[PDB]
Amino acid sequence: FDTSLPTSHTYLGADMEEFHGRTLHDDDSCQVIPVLPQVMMILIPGQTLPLQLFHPQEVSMVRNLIQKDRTFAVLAYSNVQEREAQFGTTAEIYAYREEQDFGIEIVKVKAIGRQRFKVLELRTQSDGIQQAKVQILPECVLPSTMSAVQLESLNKCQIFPSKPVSREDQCSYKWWQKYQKRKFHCANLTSWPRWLYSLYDAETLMDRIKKQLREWDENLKDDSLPSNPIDFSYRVAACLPIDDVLRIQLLKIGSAIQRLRCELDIMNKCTSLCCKQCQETEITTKNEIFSLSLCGPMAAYVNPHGYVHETLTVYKACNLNLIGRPSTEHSWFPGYAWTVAQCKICASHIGWKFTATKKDMSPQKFWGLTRSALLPTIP
Amino acid sequence: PFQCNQCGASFTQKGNLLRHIKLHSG
Numbered sequence: 001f002d003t004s005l006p007t008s009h010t011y012l013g014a015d016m017e018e019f020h021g022r023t024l025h026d027d028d029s030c031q032v033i034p035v036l037p038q039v040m041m042i043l044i045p046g047q048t049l050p051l052q053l054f055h056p057q058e059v060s061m062v063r064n065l066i067q068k069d070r071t072f073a074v075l076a077y078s079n080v081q082e083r084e085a086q087f088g089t090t091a092e093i094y095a096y097r098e099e100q101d102f103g104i105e106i107v108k109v110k111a112i113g114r115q116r117f118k119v120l121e122l123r124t125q126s127d128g129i130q131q132a133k134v135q136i137l138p139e140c141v142l143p144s145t146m147s148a149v150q151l152e153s154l155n156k157c158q159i160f161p162s163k164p165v166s167r168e169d170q171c172s173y174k175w176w177q178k179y180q181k182r183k184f185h186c187a188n189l190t191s192w193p194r195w196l197y198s199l200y201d202a203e204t205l206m207d208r209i210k211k212q213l214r215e216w217d218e219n220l221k222d223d224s225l226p227s228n229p230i231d232f233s234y235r236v237a238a239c240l241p242i243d244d245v246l247r248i249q250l251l252k253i254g255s256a257i258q259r260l261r262c263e264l265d266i267m268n269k270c271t272s273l274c275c276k277q278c279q280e281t282e283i284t285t286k287n288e289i290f291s292l293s294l295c296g297p298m299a300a301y302v303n304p305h306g307y308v309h310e311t312l313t314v315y316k317a318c319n320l321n322l323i324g325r326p327s328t329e330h331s332w333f334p335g336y337a338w339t340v341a342q343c344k345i346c347a348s349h350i351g352w353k354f355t356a357t358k359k360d361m362s363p364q365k366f367w368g369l370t371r372s373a374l375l376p377t378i379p
Numbered sequence: 380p381f382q383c384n385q386c387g388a389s390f391t392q393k394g395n396l397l398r399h400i401k402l403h404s405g
């Protein structure tokens with residue numbers, strides 16, 4: 001089906017009281033922001049997080065947070081648990097509603113990462129929620145590499161014409177070569193060639209990543225993937241399956257160009273996926289992962305008991321056993337059901353099988369694999 | 380009869396559930 005339904009989380013609720021999001025701090029700051037417990041994942045800025053909180057204390061914290069500035073900390077827990085965190089992301093709330101249900105206090109929340117911080121101290125409060133003294137990392141952008149030695153005479157020959165049509169044979173290599181030769185004409189003053197300066201270019205890395213991502217979807221260049229280097233880098237980082245340590249490493253990166261180069265390197269050096277209790281599995285084909293969502297291959301989704309199963313959508317997978325009828329109670333994708341897919345050796349839960357219901361769609365397949373137990377076994 | 384959590388499975392005997400819930404931990 002379309003790609004705009006798996007981004008509003010209609011399984012959670014329909015009548016969400018939304019808010020216009022304007023809440024930003026200014027670089028160097030010492031601000032105390034609340035930390036929601038029982039959440040353990042790395043949140044890239046710009047990524048949506050759906051929360052369904054049941055415990056009375058967390059509900060009260062969210063109720064107080066809505067009235068004040070709607071922001072809370074999502075600490076990027078390292079390999080060590082028990083508050084052993086050093087970095088994290090601030091999440092702004094824009095969706096919120098309560099449902100008495102079988103009378104407890106249920107609150108459903110949707111929030112997106114906004115800024116990046118490093119923690120200084122983690123003062124705990126006797127109420128059950130812990131605050132966090134955090135310093136906010138600035139979003140620094142470096143100037144153009146040619147601007148340092150750009151010739152004064154050669155400044156008008158820098159505004160290139162827009163992209164003609166899109167993704168046509170001989171419409172990329174022919175134009176990109178001319179762009180490289182014209183923009184980096186001052187490279188001959190220095191002792192480095194033009195292609196080396198093209199390696200550290202802003203738009204060039206964007207287009208290489210776009211070319212290597214077009215194997216996943218058909219999104220138009222003029223939209224979808226944002227033109228902003230920062231937004232593009234974060235969006236690309238939030239939609240790739242590798243281990244947490246590399247998410248923390250990518251989050252630590254300060255400049256957009258360094259992050260873009262790191263994303264290209266990892267994207268070239270990743271080949272397979274594997275179970276995280278076993279030796280091998282068949283999902284090894286990383287080429288067959290398709291984005292049936294506007295948010296990319298992956299997004300964050302919440303089950304009926306609050307647990308946030310981040311899910312990777314794949315078209316084929318083996319070494320999994322399917323148990324149960326195709327139930328569709330709390331389906332994340334409205335048209336399909338789920339049938340809980342286990343592992344074939346270690347008997348560990350890995351994703352679901354989204355069987356279909358109608359004719360003119362994918363009658364089967366579309367497996368959604370959870371990130372928790374996928375080990376990117378790149379040889 | 381039985382239901383599970385975090386994953387959604389179902390088994391027939393209580394002893395089987397005790398095995399399942401431990402596999403989730405490790």
Ligand SMILES: O=C1CC[C@H](N2C(=O)c3cccc(NCc4ccc(CN5CC(N6CCOCC6)C5)cc4F)c3C2=O)C(=O)N1
Binds near residue numbers: 330331332383385386
């Ligand atoms: O695509 C998918 C697949 C993955 C996912 N997934 C699970 O991981 C799961 C676990 C258990 C049951 C189950 N099946 C649907 C279902 C839906 C609702 C309820 C009722 N609950 C009790 C009520 N709350 C009570 C207070 O606090 C507790 C909650 C809410 C049970 C139930 F079962 C699911 C379920 O579908 C999902 O959501 N989507």
Ligand SMILES: [Zn+2]
Binds near residue numbers: 276277345346347
């Ligand atoms: Zn396994």
Ligand SMILES: [Zn+2]
Binds near residue numbers: 383384385386388399
């Ligand atoms: Zn289970």
